Nucleic acid binder design. Sequence first.
RNA 1: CCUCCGU
Length: 56
Amino acid sequence: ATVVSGQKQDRQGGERRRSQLDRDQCAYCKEKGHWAKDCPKKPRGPRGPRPQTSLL
RNA sequence: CCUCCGU
Ligand SMILES: [Zn+2]
């Protein structure tokens, strides 16, 4: 079963104004009520991009 | 994916 599981948080980004960033606002779509972590605009998952290295 | 800088 699933009990223990690590967490991979890759921080990145920083080019916008926190116009009175509401503690109950969304820092994604700018919607008030839901959090970015719960942004209904976010893409479905699991489905993340891959780096896929190949020469260079 | 894009706008998750707030964990
Ligand atoms: Zn949102």
